[PDB]
């Protein structure tokens, strides 16, 4: 048949979710580099890189395997270059560094880029597993979003703050059982790894080497190496949520090592999700779940597989919806509390600044409900924007790209004038938002994105030369064309003075 949820595994999804909340509430109501490296993996192990990485390898080939070198070229850069600067100066948080190297105005111009990047990303951490819960249950797609949003805004009652190791080992601990449920049963349903790796070659899904040296193609070897490094350096080098847990480590050699331990963990989640993408093709190289036996979104290709493969095993398809949901309760509550304490630290200095602690403790939970509405409101926007991995790396590239340019202009260039960086940032943020929205309004043609076949069978003038030659830029180049503008513009204005 097809297989769906039963009454017995529904509690398995709810029971594994509440115990993760039970670990968090006990240590709240109560760094030696091995915990914080696993806590650095749990931020990577979101519902974007579990639900959407197989559905993207299944459609656009396994060129995504070249990211295993991209994950190596970012942890080399983010440990040699960006790590000894934020550590040896005794920095508390990486946006306080910007008023040390430049004036205080660019820090308020810096964290406003962080807020628009965060609320655009945390709408994709929320909407993606709600796009999975709508598939397995048919609940509703717009109601499961506001279901997920209100349980994290009420988790801002000092439960989401003070992140513990024990609520982060459970994220991987379910996810090491979530993939091993779906990898192992897919091999025995298809008869060997050498059968999964045989129909994928006949479908053209291998696709490991492209080497085409033009930026207009979406996935090359050069886009993933050059442009993909500049995207992920904006996450592991300058993003405040992933530098706060580098300074908090005690020894400088250990904090460097924590960035080198999760490189194994990033290589694990990439290999265990690319191989789910090749498993997802060999199961459906006759009747895809698109075009027939439909799933609304492309990101409903992993939860459609799980109820198709684990239908005769009760208990286990609730575990796959659990590990998609397990990442969000740690991410979004920390995502909101990162937006909470930074905003009230930003707000008090142009305010009256002499209010009492009763209003300040009120406004810490005053804006936390406001941002959760902006978390929900941007999650309704994320029903657009497409593939939800292409959109999760664009809003890292098109917004957080030029933000990485300031730290490149500050650290490397010794003569960065502060009036040069402020007009350098807003020039770079304008070029990236020009190409970043131009691609998401007019998508690239399929001769540049190269999507693969889907095989519906065996189931028993418009273009203008700006829209074609620059809006078809690769989505991993929205930070290269952002950083290499605010480094060029940021120097020549500084060179003018």
């Amino acid at each position, epitope marked *: 048949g097809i297989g769906t949820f039963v009454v017995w595994d529904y509690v398995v999804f709810a029971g594994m979710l509440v115990i993760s909340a039970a670990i968090g509430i006990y240590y709240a109501f109560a760094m030696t580099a091995v915990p914080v490296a696993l806590s650095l993996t749990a931020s990577f192990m979101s519902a974007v890189t579990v639900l959407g990485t197989p559905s993207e390898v299944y*459609r656009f080939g396994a060129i995504f395997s070249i990211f295993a070198f991209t994950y190596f070229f970012v942890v080399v850069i983010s440990a040699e270059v960006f790590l000894p600067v934020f550590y040896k100066l005794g920095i508390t948080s990486t946006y306080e560094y910007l008023e040390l190297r430049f004036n205080k105005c660019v820090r308020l111009c810096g964290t406003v880029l962080f807020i628009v990047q965060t609320i655009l990303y945390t709408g994709i951490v929320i909407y993606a597993p709600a796009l999975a819960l709508n598939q397995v249950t048919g609940f509703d797609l717009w109601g499961a979003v506001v279901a997920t949003g209100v349980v994290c805004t009420f988790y801002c009652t000092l439960g989401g703050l003070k992140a513990v190791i024990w609520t982060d080992v459970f994220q991987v601990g379910i996810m090491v059982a979530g993939f091993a449920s779906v990898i192992i049963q897919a091999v025995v349903m298809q008869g060997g790894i050498s059968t999964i790796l045989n129909d994928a070659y006949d*479908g053209g899904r291998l696709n490991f080497w492209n080497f085409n040296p033009n930026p207009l193609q979406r996935h090359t070897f050069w886009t993933i190496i050059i442009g993909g490094t500049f995207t992920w350096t904006s996450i592991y080098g300058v993003n405040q949520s992933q530098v706060q847990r580098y300074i908090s480590c005690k020894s400088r050699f250990q904090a460097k090592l924590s960035l080198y331990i999760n490189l194994v963990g990033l290589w694990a989640i990439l290999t265990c999700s690319v191989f789910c993408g090749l498993a997802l093709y060999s199961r459906y190289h006759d009747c895809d779940p698109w*075009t027939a036996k439909k799933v609304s979104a492309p990101d409903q290709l992993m939860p459609y597989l799980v109820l198709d493969i684990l239908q005769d095993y009760p208990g286990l398809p609730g575990l796959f919806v659990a590990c998609a949901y397990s990442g969000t309760l740690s991410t979004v509550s920390s995502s909101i509390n990162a937006l909470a304490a930074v905003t009230v630290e930003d707000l008090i200095k142009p305010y009256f600044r002499s209010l009492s602690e009763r209003s300040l403790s009120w406004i810490s939970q005053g804006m936390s409900v406001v941002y959760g509405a902006l978390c929900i409101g941007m999650a309704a926007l994320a029903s657009l924007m497409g593939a939800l991995l292409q959109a999760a790396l664009s809003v890292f590239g098109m917004v957080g790209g030029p933000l990485m340019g300031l730290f490149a202009l500050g650290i490397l260039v010794p003569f960065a004038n502060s009036i040069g960086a402020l007009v350098g940032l807003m020039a770079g943020f304008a070029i990236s938002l020009w190409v970043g929205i131009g691609a998401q309004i007019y998508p690239p043609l399929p001769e540049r994105t190269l999507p693969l076949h889907l095989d519906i069978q065996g189931c028993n003038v418009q273009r203008t030369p700006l829209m074609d030659n620059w809006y078809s830029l690769s989505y991993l180049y929205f930070s290269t064309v952002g950083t290499l503008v605010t480094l060029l513009v940021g120097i020549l204005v500084s060179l003018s003075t």
Partner: nanobody, 122 residues
Framework: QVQLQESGGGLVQAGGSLRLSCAAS????????MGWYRQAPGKEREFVAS???????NYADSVKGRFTISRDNAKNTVYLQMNSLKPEDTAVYYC????????????????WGQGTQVTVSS
């Protein structure tokens, strides 16, 4: 990406026979639905002769019966074969492979190969 090539075409007698071959290198999907388009001088991209993985063979109304086409899935190639060559059906011929990548109707792209000119005499 697929970088496909072709051969088998040139000057023949008007009324004879010919077999046009077309290989397909790269990481081309086998269950693809390769086809055969042509372009007359000064005209538009002309008919499709599509053959899918299930060998459901299609023709245009001008070329029913007189032309035939068959593929084999072992080497990913297609053979377009000619009979009853008219004095005016001469054109350049392209070897397309119609990918389908989505649920809608207007989402297909073609991977056009290089041309091959076939001419007649009388």
């Amino acid at each position: 990406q697929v970088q496909l090539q072709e051969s088998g075409g040139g000057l023949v007698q008007a009324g004879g026979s010919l077999r046009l071959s077309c290989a397909a290198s790269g990481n081309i999907s086998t269950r693809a639905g390769m086809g055969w388009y042509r372009q007359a001088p000064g005209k538009e991209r002309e008919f499709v002769a599509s053959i899918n993985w299930g060998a459901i063979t299609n023709y245009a109304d001008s070329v029913k019966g007189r032309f035939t086409i068959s593929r084999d899935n072992a080497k990913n190639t297609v053979y377009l074969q000619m009979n009853s060559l008219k004095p005016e059906d001469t054109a350049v011929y392209y070897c397309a492979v119609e990918y389908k990548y989505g649920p809608q109707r207007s989402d297909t792209y073609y991977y056009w190969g290089q041309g091959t000119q076939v001419t007649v005499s009388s």
